[PDB]
């Protein structure tokens, strides 16, 4: 791996890999997005040397592949009966790998856990950096749109007993656990990641709407609080609808301190006060006594 150069060649065709040298145009704006094409001669300068990736990234890639396959199977199973109100005999055909997906979700939650604060600064920072790197590696190769698709395909059902079981059976006890585990995994993926929170800020309206679910509020509030405290730019994007929805969530779920923490996050930004949010909270929450 120490600057040992080599060439790659097909055995049957006998061709070699060089630059394709395509037509140069500013359509895709590809700085180096050129297709690799087996060519006869090319420019005789396409020798590549080898470097070895580390065990951490190799494991991350392997779990990425396995989890992607499992999630694809799960979403296929979910969409199989999307428009099939069978009624009598709710289950038919292939069965959802509920146990496997539960175990995978638990293992991934344990994998992406924040380091304990009872360690010295050097190892604390090292573990934090490793966690951030692994979270970014998972985020880049999807795994955020995947869990978003999983959760928004699951949440098409609300009653969780009968209208969620009109298209399935034996999964009644595997509904709440799946939803909670998905919410926890979503929270842990973006917990303390500036880039991940910035990327996830696109569906802030969806996250706000998910608050009044009565089944996933515990995880949804945590996700909203984390994104608010890690990406202090969606405060301007916050409208009156979000504030009213959060206040209604507080009124629906009773007295709580996490709601007040979320409102405090919706208050002044990273060193800059947001008078719009301040006045919205003042004129909504507490002219409205009792």
């Amino acid at each position: 791996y120490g600057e040992s150069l080599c060439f790659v060649q097909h055995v049957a065709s006998g061709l070699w890999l060089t630059y394709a040298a395509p037509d140069p145009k500013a359509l895709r704006l590809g700085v180096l997005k050129k297709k690799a094409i087996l060519h006869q001669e090319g420019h005789m300068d396409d020798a590549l040397f080898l470097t070895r990736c580390q065990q951490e990234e190799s494991q991350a890639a392997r779990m990425i592949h396995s989890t992607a396959g499992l999630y694809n199977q799960f979403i296929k199973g979910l969409d199989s009966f999307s428009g099939k109100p069978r009624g009598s005999g709710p289950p038919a055909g292939p069965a959802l790998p509920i146990e496997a997906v539960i175990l995978s979700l638990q293992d991934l939650i344990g994998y992406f856990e924040p380091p304990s604060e009872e360690l010295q600064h050097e190892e604390k920072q090292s573990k934090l950096r490793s966690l951030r790197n692994r979270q970014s590696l998972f985020q880049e190769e999807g795994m955020l749109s995947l869990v978003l698709n999983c959760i928004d395909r699951l949440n098409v059902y609300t009653t969780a007993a009968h209208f969620a079981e009109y298209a399935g059976e034996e999964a009644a006890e595997s509904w709440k656990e799946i939803v909670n585990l998905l919410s926890e995994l979503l929270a842990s993926l973006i917990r303390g990641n500036r880039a991940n929170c910035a990327l996830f800020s696109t569906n802030l309206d969806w996250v706000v709407s998910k608050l009044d679910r009565l089944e996933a509020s515990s995880g949804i509030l945590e996700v909203l609080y984390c994104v608010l405290i890690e990406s202090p730019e969606v405060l301007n994007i916050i409208q009156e609808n979000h504030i009213k929805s959060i206040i209604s969530l507080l009124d629906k779920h009773g007295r709580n301190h996490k709601v007040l923490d979320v409102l405090c996050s919706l208050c002044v930004c990273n060193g800059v006060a947001v008078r719009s949010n301040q006045d919205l909270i003042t004129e909504n929450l507490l002219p409205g006594r009792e």
Binding site: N236, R255, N256, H257, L260, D261, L263, C264, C267, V268, C269, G271, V272, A273, V274, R275, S276, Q278, D279, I281, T282, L286
Partner: protein, 759 residues
Amino acid sequence: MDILELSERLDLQRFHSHTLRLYRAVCALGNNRVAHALCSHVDQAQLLHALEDAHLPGPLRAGYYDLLISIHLESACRSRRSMLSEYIVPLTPETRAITLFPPGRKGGNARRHGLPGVGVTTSLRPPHHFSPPCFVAALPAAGVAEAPARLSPAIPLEALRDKALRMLGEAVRDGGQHARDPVGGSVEFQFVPVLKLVSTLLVMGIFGDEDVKQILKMIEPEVFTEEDLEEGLLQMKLPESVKLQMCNLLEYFCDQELQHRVESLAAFAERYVDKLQANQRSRYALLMRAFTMSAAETARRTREFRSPPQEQINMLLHFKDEADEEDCPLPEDIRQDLQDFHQDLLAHCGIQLEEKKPQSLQELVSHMVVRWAQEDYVQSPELVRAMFSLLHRQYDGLGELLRALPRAYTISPSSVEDTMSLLECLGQIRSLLIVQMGPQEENLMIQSIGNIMNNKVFYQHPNLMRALGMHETVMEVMVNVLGGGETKEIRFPKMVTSCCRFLCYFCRISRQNQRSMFDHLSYLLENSGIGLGMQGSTPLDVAAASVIDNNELALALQEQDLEKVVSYLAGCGLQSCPMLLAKGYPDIGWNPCGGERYLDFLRFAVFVNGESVEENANVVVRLLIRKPECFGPALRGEGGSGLLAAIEEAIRISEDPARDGPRVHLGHAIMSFYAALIDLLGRCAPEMHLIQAGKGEALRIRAILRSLVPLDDLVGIISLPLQIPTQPKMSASFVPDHKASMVLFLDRVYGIENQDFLL
């Protein structure tokens, strides 16, 4: 139910320990309107009752104390604290009596410093402008921009200061018994909330003279009482959360000591410079009125009368310390006084070498900080940083005094009110900086800027505004707005022009002000983009005003900044600027208005003062024509059309045709771009044979630019009549003084000897 029941009902205490947080987080960082609204829910009686209550739980005691601080004494303290660094001292008889005062009354001058913080500190500081809270007002309907933003809610200060002293006195008394039941949950909840209120009250200058003495005596009765029982706060064991707060109390006193030092020395100047001015008059009169000594007294008079005032004082003050030679036409009596004053300053400010008790602040705090860290391993990083930030200051007083001098200034009476109305407007701009841009803030910022501009003194003391960060703060405001999400012109316009107007007006008063603003050119040139400066100013307008006439800074320009303008000009001059297309203007692959106003900066950077800087003209010429897609390449001979052919079709489409949209029409703008280009080429031409005859580079550039524009078309352009003098016209095309850009090009390039002198 009784609020004290929350000491057991932990389910509701946690919610109420966070509701108070939301109360003081919804009105934080200004927002004095909400702070008035909160006065209807938590009135004065509840806050005052909770201040002295001893049965309240731990978290709720700290929550109520900070709620009162963040409602009544937050906006009025942040403004005072931020501006407190700058020192402005008037020259009044009250200030005259102020001296450094190493106390020589009833004892030697090397006595106790004398309870710092009780002096006659007379720096200019506006009041707090409190407003009484009422809820039966009319609440008139007014616009957001025209709204006179509310002040902080009022509260009796005399009651608050007397109360706050009482709790601190009781707390330091009850702490000596070491009882097993503190006021709050522990000793941390008993000493911290009261200490925060005292620290907040101190920086606003609310405590009187005897009130500070009580604070100093209670803090330490061994070194601060001038004329274990009653032990100070420095003796008994305290946790880190309490050690942090006492580091802020001692920080204020050190600032008080420093403010006393700088004000005293500035007041000493009027006592010393008055003697020097009188002595200088006598010295000059004796040397000049008595000319019988010799007829060659110019040697002894040029160095004392034909020199700038800076050289006069510097040479005079160079005496009394120049290796026992003293090299001056200055007497011996006043020389001793200055040396005596210097020794007085040194003794008071640190160095005094020329189980002992401290006897002064500079040794008490130094030993305490050393004692604190050696007793135990400090865990909280904030205390560790604060401890050394206070220890280092006390171990080096000269450095802090030296650093405070650039912000120190002196002002004569009858103009304090002029300065008074400037500091208040400056504070409004500083306060609005931590607030998101809004129509209310934008209107308020403009009003403050307008008052600042022509107040009384923006022209009288330019050097005062060189310090104090006057220009930097306004620039920082511009930077925040100009950032945007890839676009900022739509983001709150009509305010960037005013801030740019302030900067342009800031550069026209002094060269040093212009010199300081020139340092911010990389960012300034980078954001010289869309423009749209139909009124006011542009981001490039201030950049041009920084190099309008320097002859020293124009030579200091780099190569990237000049190459950026032409590269930006090339892109500007190749498109139609679709902003013009919004009005229905015809589409042409060249910007007439954008290009004309873009190279005007280069016209100022290459023509310094009546000359052509050869260090930049050669660079400008190369990059100007390096890219063929410049100087209007469509009809400038580059594309094959010709410069002479550019003005032909331009006239036919300018003399009032109905082939364009509605004062930004494709008229004068079409032909002004080339006129400015001709002028810009004329400015960079070699001056005369001083470089042309001697060097061959001057003629080489002259030949290159001569080939760009042949003389065959200059005669045609100048021969074209301007317009009918009588009926009149407007800024449409071919203005009467347009025969100036071509004329100067002819003078500086071709000239006339005998051939063209006839036709």
